[PDB]
Amino acid sequence: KKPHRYRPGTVALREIRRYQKSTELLIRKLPFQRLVREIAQDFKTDLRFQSSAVMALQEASEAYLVALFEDTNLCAIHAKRVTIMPKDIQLARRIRGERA
Amino acid sequence: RLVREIAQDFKTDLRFQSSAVMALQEASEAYLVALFEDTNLCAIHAKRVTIMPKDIQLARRIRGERA
Amino acid sequence: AGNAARDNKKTRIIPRHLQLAVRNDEELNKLLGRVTIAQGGVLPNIQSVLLPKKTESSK
Amino acid sequence: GRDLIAYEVKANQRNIEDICICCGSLQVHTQHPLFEGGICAPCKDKFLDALFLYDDDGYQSYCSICCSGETLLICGNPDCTRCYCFECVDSLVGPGTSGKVHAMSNWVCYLCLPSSRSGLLQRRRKWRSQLKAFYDRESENPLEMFETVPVWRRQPVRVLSLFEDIKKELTSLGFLESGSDPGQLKHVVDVTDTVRKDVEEWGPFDLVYGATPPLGHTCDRPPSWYLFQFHRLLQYARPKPGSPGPFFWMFVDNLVLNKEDLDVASRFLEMEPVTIPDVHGGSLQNAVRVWSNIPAIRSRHWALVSEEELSLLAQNKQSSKLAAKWPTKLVKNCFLPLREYFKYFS
Amino acid sequence: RHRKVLRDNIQGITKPAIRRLARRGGVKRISGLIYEETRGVLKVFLENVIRDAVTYTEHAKRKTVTAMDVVYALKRQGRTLYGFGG
Amino acid sequence: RTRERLVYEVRQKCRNIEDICISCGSLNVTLEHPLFVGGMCQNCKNCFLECAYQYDDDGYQSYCTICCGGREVLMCGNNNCCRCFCVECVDLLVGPGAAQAAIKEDPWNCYMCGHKGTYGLLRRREDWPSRLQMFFAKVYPPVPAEKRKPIRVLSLFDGIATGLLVLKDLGIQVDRYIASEVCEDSITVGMVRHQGKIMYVGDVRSVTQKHIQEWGPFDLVIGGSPCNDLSIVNPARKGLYEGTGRLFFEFYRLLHDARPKEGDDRPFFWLFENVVAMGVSDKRDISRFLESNPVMIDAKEVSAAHRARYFWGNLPGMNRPLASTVNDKLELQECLEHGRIAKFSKVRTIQHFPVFMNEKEDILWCTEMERVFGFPVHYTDVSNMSRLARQRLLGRSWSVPVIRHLFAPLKEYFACV
DNA sequence: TCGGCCGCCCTGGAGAATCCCGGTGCCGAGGCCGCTCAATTGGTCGTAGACAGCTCTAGCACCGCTTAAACGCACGTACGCGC
DNA sequence: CGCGTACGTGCGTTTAAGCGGTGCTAGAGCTGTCTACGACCAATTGAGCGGCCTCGGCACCGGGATTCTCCAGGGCGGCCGA
């Protein structure tokens, strides 16, 4: 009984406090940049991007996902659960009126 | 009478056109039917068929109207 | 934002201070509801059901 | 039937006690507390409830005499809180006088005038003791009832404010005279070394106010300390038993004491708290619990206000602590029934 | 002056009215505490829309609220109403 | 550092040791040090109130007796002494390196005990117990005997009904004995030992002024609030304003409700007890609220236990020195049973096992602890209660002969058997 | 008979993480300087809007029937909720 | 899966929404006058922005207090079912 081990509630809630008290970007920059370039390949061939444009996309996309997981967590709590499910994301986007 | 009572707090001695009250009634009934549709989805998601004030509060929280 | 900077022991307003300044106020949050501020984050607000019960049984 | 109750007395030669002066009814249960006459049972029940109820908009939510909602006028002399309906004034003293009363804000009401005989109104001598008997017969709750202070036998209020200043509030509320500092309010930040001898030296007190810290936790001292010291200095400041003297108190909590400390405070002050919500700016703003022995303060709590919503607001306020002003304006209103007890400075 | 203050007209929204609005919304079963919450939400919605529309009437130097001021108050709140003039 | 530099000018015959505060080196000398030669500032006096009578779980003092601080202290080898001296003070007032020289001495006596009185620049005045005594230190007339009546006693946080037992031992007629208690074992004790005469109430937090009024006048109000949340030696303490500390305020309320109004000159007396280890702010607030200064009374004078307690109250002559009676057992060995030997001469409750039996270290017996605290034997042997529960019950209880000393002049005010 | 196993209170001790506190370093913000173009001032026209007047449309108010629906009470079984 | 409560259903009452008239009058809406307020243009300058710089507010590193977190344990104990 020498290696110490925590509980599943503790480490999760410490991560919640840590990433709520921080401001930095959480998605890696180069995979997100390759994702934006691959999605932009369909609408027009041979784009060019500015660094500020890709950073603005990443800021807005991470803020959108954090608000989406806020409503997802509320939908999970409302069903007497704590674990989020794809039903919660579909319900949050169906009440936001974005299913199109 | 509800529209006149709510209007008496903002301005005294008002006067409504009948078409204005009909437009308010159309918009308010359509808003309440859409709200009961999202309230019904919140009720079904909690493995229930009974809507409760929790469902209306959750619908107006996810819409962003707790402000 | 100057009150949020003074709370954080800083004499320079960073976008975290503008984020805490707008979102803690209710009328500024109503004004800037559909507005994202870059390098802000979110409010440190944890729901009261995800915490473990740090209480003692009276019986 | 409101022009008939002015006809049953003059013509039929009947006793005012034999007609319900409120709704004009002929059935009389009891005798009216403020003036000579009778009151039917429903109006009697509602009249008692109306006094308990506290309204932010006006001195009285519903009318004093007949308990009507609308037709509210304000008392001329600013040292009086009485409010009567237009229909009472028209029915009793004569038609087309209510409009004249409402037309000015400096019209001396019925209790401030030297003569209390207007034509169909009779005052009662030492009415407050009879009023306590009225509460004793049917109100089912003997709420803390100090003798009323007449205008002619009025004293300058002596105030002891502990842990929080109210001189601005009371000055705005007309309890403290501005421009002249005889020292009728002593603010005492630290009371750990206050002794009965000190309080006796400070002059006799009639109203001792205390309040919890604001939501920004300015001081690093447990909030129960304010309550316990407030109780101690309160007991010290109570007049010698067997003396006709008014002693009022009020301890105010801005949700800084948990349920343990809340029950403790409720036990010592020997009553349940009073939760007051503030004007919604969309959802809910802030709320405050108040203990006091001041009339119509216990009924100020609103049954709509839930505990869980209050707990959530408390935890969003404690952790966030954006505003850090003591809510002086929130607890400002609650002293309003006290207006008839001390002198008002306009 | 000559205007009786209208009061308790939130109870004019009757229980079968909220019942029929829940039938159109597809709701199969309604709890007893729905009706007070629905009256409160409808009251706040009318507060917002009439708060815009009375200000549109104020700036127009009139004393009559038109249907066009209702359509402007709703189109400002991102709820565009048709059938009354855009 | 600065204090050490000053003591340099003290030993160079440039400053009088009596003109400096020997605890912290402040210049604001007002009082003299009661134990040794030197001055004392007010701040150190408050610290001296808290810290002198604080003992750790080893039965030795928690802090140095001189400066009432210190990071590492020297314990005393000599019998019955519980004092400690912090290394720093010793390396100044006595001399440099004297402390580590005392560390190396396996049979070491601390400077409060050693036969000689002179120790370098440190000098001990021989009148220190009497000066210490004085340091920690509406009157009703006598009632003529024929007019005397049976006493009516309210005992809040009654515990094992020690007060009724003391009044019975003094032979005072008790009309009624109302007692608040919540521990089932303690409720049982009073019922059995006093034959159902004790009116058991329940939670003291249910007791109203109406209850007190309808229970008939009380002649004596007594009590000791829980000390777990007041005693400073508990790291997790919640203070006077949190946890179980606040039950004292309930005592203050019911005392206020039970006290006669001005102009009603009927005899009324009260006694409140607490631990000496209570904080400065806590002790000050309690002393201010009870409108009196506490008397400090140590059990060691009459009860063979080192139990120093504060007693607030208005019992006549409660300053007078404690006079032992032949009935009292001043020796711990005079309380143990045959075949058992007392390690120390006094037990410590504010070696861990103070019994030598058959060349083995045994724990204290519950009945021997009863005899020490002055209770008549087998007082707490009423129900099927655990050893732990009986130990806790005797621990929280009053020292009987101390209560007999305080209650003794009440015999001149109420009816006797 | 009778000795060996699970809540309960009580308590705290290792212990990984976090808050506080200093020490150093760096690069980004506060402040100075030229200069140049947009803000200011003066004057002039031209028409948008302020205002008087009239009119005549619809909005509010009232009243009397008329059933359509809201209400209230019983009741029973289907669903919400705790385990 | 068990339980119980509270909500849907039904019938008898009664409350009032709806409709169909009249009146009148407040107020929207249109028209005519005119005048003062803002667009336009020319002179001119000082306030605001590019550029420079230097230095201290904050990021990072390192160490101690500390503080909640998890788990052992005393005991206990009785009780209990082996």
Ligand SMILES: Nc1ncnc2c1ncn2[C@@H]1O[C@H](CSCC[C@H](N)C(=O)O)[C@@H](O)[C@H]1O
């Ligand atoms: N809330 C409460 N209401 C009534 N009694 C309480 C209480 N909290 C603690 N007590 C009791 O009060 C006692 C205080 S210890 C004092 C015991 C007593 N003086 C004696 O001589 O025996 C404790 O034994 C405890 O059981």
Ligand SMILES: [Zn+2]
């Ligand atoms: Zn009546």
Ligand SMILES: [Zn+2]
């Ligand atoms: Zn008046």
Ligand SMILES: [Zn+2]
């Ligand atoms: Zn009236």
Ligand SMILES: [Zn+2]
């Ligand atoms: Zn000192």
Ligand SMILES: [Zn+2]
């Ligand atoms: Zn020392």
Ligand SMILES: [Zn+2]
């Ligand atoms: Zn010694």
